[PDB]
Amino acid sequence: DLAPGIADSLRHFKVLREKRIPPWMEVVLIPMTGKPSLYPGLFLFTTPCRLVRPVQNLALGKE
Amino acid sequence: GGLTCASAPQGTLRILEGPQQSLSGSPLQPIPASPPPQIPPGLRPRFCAFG
């Protein structure tokens, strides 16, 4: 019950360039249900070879 | 005079620091939507027949 808020807080840091979260960290939160969905858990990638793309973040308008 | 195990704790407190959510405004774009291509005013014909 803290994973959603943590993911949203981390996404707000990267968007507003707060803390030291790299502007390009991927905060992923693969939810867990009872179904055979992808393995659950909060990943956070910041490695130097991933592909990224810009999108206008609504609720903040901060790209 | 040594250290002995004492009574089991009755509870646990876990502290974390968290900020809150603002209002939903959803300001999608500076100049928004795909603005349509359109007619230059008046224009005028730039060609005539012979005769």
Searching chain A, which residue's CA lies closest to the CA of residue B25?
Answer: A59
Integer angstrom CA distances of residue B2 from A42, B5, B9: 44, 10, 20
R_g of chain A, CA atoms, integer Å:
13
Rounded to whole angstroms, the Cα distance separating B18 from B3 reads 38
The separation between the first and the last C-alpha atoms of chain A, rounded to the nearest angstrom, is 28
Q: Chain B contacts of A5, Cβ < 8 Å? A: 18
Dig out the tokens for A30 from the structure: 């693969």
What b/e sequence results for A18-32 when a residue is b if at least 16 CB atoms lie within 10 Å of its CB, and e otherwise?
Answer: eeebeeebebebeee
Identify how many contiguous H helices and E strands chain A contains and give both numbers.
1, 2
Of A51, A56, A29, A31, the residue nearest A42 (C-alpha): A29
Dig out the tokens for A50 from the structure: 């991933």
Rounded to whole angstroms, the Cα distance separating A7 from A12 reads 9
Contact between B27 and A5 using a beta-carbon 8 Å cutoff = no
Q: What is the resolution of this structure in A?
A: 2.9
Q: Which of A2, A8, A56 faces B28 most closely, judged by CB atoms?
A: A56
Where does residue A38 rank: exposed (0-12), middle (13-18), buried (19+ CB within 10 A)? exposed
